[PDB]
Amino acid sequence: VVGTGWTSKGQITVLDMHPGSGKTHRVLPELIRQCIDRRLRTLVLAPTRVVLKEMERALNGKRVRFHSGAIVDVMCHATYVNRRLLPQGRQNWEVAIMDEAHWTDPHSIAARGHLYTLAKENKCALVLMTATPPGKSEPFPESNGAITSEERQIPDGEWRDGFDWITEYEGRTAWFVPSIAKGGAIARTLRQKGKSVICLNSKTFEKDYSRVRDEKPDFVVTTDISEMGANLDVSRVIDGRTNIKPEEVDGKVELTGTRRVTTASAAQRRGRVGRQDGRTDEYIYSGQCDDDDSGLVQWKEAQILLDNITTVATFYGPEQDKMPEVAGHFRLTEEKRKHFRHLLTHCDFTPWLAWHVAANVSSVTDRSWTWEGPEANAVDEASGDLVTFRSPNGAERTLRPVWKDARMFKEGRDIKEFVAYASGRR
Ligand SMILES: Nc1ncnc2c1ncn2[C@@H]1O[C@H](COP(=O)(O)OP(=O)(O)O)[C@@H](O)[C@H]1O
Ligand SMILES: [Mn+2]
C-alpha cells in the first residue's frame, strides 16, 4: 500500500484496510522486514498479550525484542505508556507502528495521542493500523467473505421461548454483551438449553482466549475485549450493540446502565465473522450506534496518563475534541507520579482512582483515605452489610473511600483485593 518514505520523520500513515485485510499477519511483518533492512529503531504496539504472543510467532526476526542487539521493540499499548511514567526509562524510536489503534482503553488513547504528538513535531514516523480509524466510521465495512446482516430482537438477560433462532443454529456463535454480569445471565440460559459456553471479558481474556480454539464451544459470550484482534472462529455474531458506561458523576465513577456502541465498535464486533473467502457468515444485531462517547471517563483517564508521560501534547487528530481539560491539567510532580505509577502497576488501580489518591494524599503509606470518605461512599457486599476490615493496629474500619470508583468493586475486580490494599497488607 505504501512503497517507501512512510518511515520518514513526520509521516503519519493510516492503514484503514477493512477487517481481516492482513494488517496483523501480512502487512506488519513486511513493515518490520523493511525497518530492519534500513536499520531504523522501531516500536510495535500490540493491544493485548494474546496479540503480542501471536506477533511473536509471526516474527522470527533476529532484531526483534518482545517486552513483558535488536532494534525493533514489541510491547503492549499499556506497557509503552506505563514505562514512560518513570522519567527514568523514556527510550526513543524513529518508527512507531500501533496495531488495533481504535481501542478506546485510556492507555491506547494516551499512546496514540503521545505518538501523534511526536510525529506532528517530526520526532518520528507513525503507522496506525485499524479497520476503524478515529473519525468517520461505517457499521457494515467490507470483509474477506460475505456477511448477511439482519436486525432481530436479542435477549437482554435470561429467556425461555420465542428466540428459537438462537439455539436452532447449527454452527458456532460469538455473542457480545455490555458487561460481565449480563454475560453471566446469557451464559446460564444457554447452558440450561444444553449449549456449551465460554465467557470472555477483561478478566478472563488473557487466560481463556486459548480455550475457544481448543474446546470449540457452541457459544462465546464476550464483552468488547474481543474487538481488538481476537479470532473466535465462529460463523455468527449476535450483537445487541450495547456497552457499559463508566462515567464520572458528582465526583464519583459510576457503572450503571448501558450506552449504544460506537459505529467503530459495531464494525469490530461484526468483524469477528466474514474473515474467510468463500463462506457466508451472519451478523445478528439489534438497534443503532452512537459515536458520541465523549461523556465517558476514558477521555479523562487518557488525559491523566498523557499529561504524565510528557514534559503541548494532544490526543490523536479527531479525538482532541474529547480531551476534557487543557493539556497538562493532570500533570503530577515527579514524586507523586511515582506513587501514581505504583498504584497503577502494583495495586491494579484505575487511572482515575490512582490520580486522585496520588495527587491528594500525603504519603504512600496512608490508608485512612479508604475509610474517611463521605458516608454515601461506603461499599456494601451484595448481602447488603457494609464492608469492614482491620487496620494493622486492630481497629475496625468500614470501607468508605474519599474517592469512589465503582470499577474497583465489580466488573472484573473484587472487593477482596481492594481490602488487601486498604488494610495495609498490599
Ligand atoms: N495463522 C493465521 N493467523 C491469523 N490469520 C490468519 C492465519 N492464517 C491465515 N490467516 C488469515 O488472515 C486474514 C486476517 O489477517 P489479519 O492480519 O488478522 O487481518 P486484519 O489485521 O486486517 O484484521 C484472514 O483471512 C485469516 O483467515
Ligand atoms: Mn488486526
Shortest-distance atom of ligand 1 to CA 19: 23
CB of 17 within 6 A of ligand 1: the answer is: yes
CB of 167 within 6 A of ligand 1: the answer is: no
CA 78/CA 350 separation, integer angstroms: 13
Q: Which residues contact 135 (CB under 8 A, 6 or more apart)?
A: 317, 318
Closest CA to 17 of 115, 133, 109, 126: 133
Shortest-distance atom of ligand 1 to CA 25: 17
Shared domain check, 241 and 173: yes
Give 56-98 as a DSSP string.
Answer: HHH---TTEEE----SEEEEEHHHHHHHTTSTT-----SEEEE
Q: Whose CA is nearest to atom 2 of ligand 1?
A: 25
Contact between 300 and 170 (Cβ < 8 Å):
no
Q: Whose CA is nearest to atom 13 of ligand 1?
A: 20
CA 195/CA 197 separation, integer angstroms: 6
Q: Whose CA is nearest to atom 4 of ligand 1?
A: 25
Region for 192 from its dihedrals, namely left if φ exceeds 0, alpha if ψ lies in -120 to 50, beta otherwise: alpha
Q: Which residues contact 363 (CB under 8 A, 6 or more apart)?
A: none
Contact between 48 and 229 (Cβ < 8 Å):
yes
Q: How far is CA 294 from the centre of its chain?
A: 16
CB of 144 within 6 A of ligand 1: the answer is: yes
Shared domain check, 79 and 157: no
Sign for the CA dihedral angle at 277, 279, 280, 282 comes to: negative
For cell 497503577, what's the residue?
344
Alpha-carbon torsion, ordered 410, 411, 412, 414, to 10 deg? 0
How far, CA to CA in Å, does 146 sit from each of 25, 165, 232, 236, 277? 21, 20, 17, 12, 8
Shared domain check, 279 and 150: yes
Shared domain check, 150 and 280: yes
How far, CA to CA in Å, does 334 sit from each of 5, 39, 136, 157? 38, 34, 38, 47
Shortest-distance atom of ligand 1 to CA 17: 22
How far, CA to CA in Å, does 278 sit from each of 145, 264, 281? 6, 25, 10
How was this structure determined? It was done by X-ray
Which stretch of DSSP H or E encloses residue 405?
A: none
Ligand 2: distance of its center to the CA of 264 in Å? 14
Shared domain check, 188 and 125: no
With H, G, I as helix, E, B as strand and everything else as coil, classify residue 244: strand
Residue 49 has which C-alpha cell? Answer: 498479550
Ligand 2: distance of its center to the CA of 186 in Å? 28
On the 0-12 / 13-18 / 19+ scale of CB atoms within 10 A, 365 is exposed
CA 412/CA 203 separation, integer angstroms: 5
Contact between 284 and 150 (Cβ < 8 Å):
yes
Q: Given ligand 1 and candidates 16, 17, 25, 276, which is best to mutate, with the most ligand atoms within 8 Å of its CB?
A: 25
Closest ligand to Cα 267: 1
Query: Cα-flanking dihedrals φ and ψ of residue 157, to 5°?
Result: 165, -165
Shared domain check, 212 and 117: no
Residue 242 has which C-alpha cell? Answer: 450495547
Residue 287 has which C-alpha cell? Answer: 438497534
Per-residue burial over 275-299, b = 16 or more CB atoms within 10 Å of its CB, e = otherwise: beeeeebbbbbeeebeeebeebbbb
Query: Cα-flanking dihedrals φ and ψ of residue 334, to 5°?
Result: -65, -50
What's the chain's Rg over C-alpha atoms?
22
Residue 80 has which C-alpha cell? Answer: 509503552
Ligand 2: distance of its center to the CA of 19 in Å? 7
Please report how the helices 28-37 and 49-58 are oriented relative to each other, as an axis angle in degrees rounded to 10.
60
CA 28/CA 49 separation, integer angstroms: 17
CB of 102 within 6 A of ligand 1: the answer is: no
Shared domain check, 102 and 50: yes
Shared domain check, 190 and 115: no
Shared domain check, 90 and 22: yes
Contact between 248 and 256 (Cβ < 8 Å):
no
Which stretch of DSSP H or E encloses residue 282?
A: strand 281-285
Ligand 1: distance of its center to the CA of 18 in Å? 12
Ligand 2: distance of its center to the CA of 4 in Å? 22
Shortest-distance atom of ligand 1 to CA 21: 22
Shared domain check, 109 and 224: no
Ligand 1: distance of its center to the CA of 275 in Å? 8
Shared domain check, 113 and 19: yes
Shared domain check, 270 and 184: yes
Which residues form the domain of 55?
Answer: 12-129
Closest CA to 16 of 144, 148, 141, 145: 141
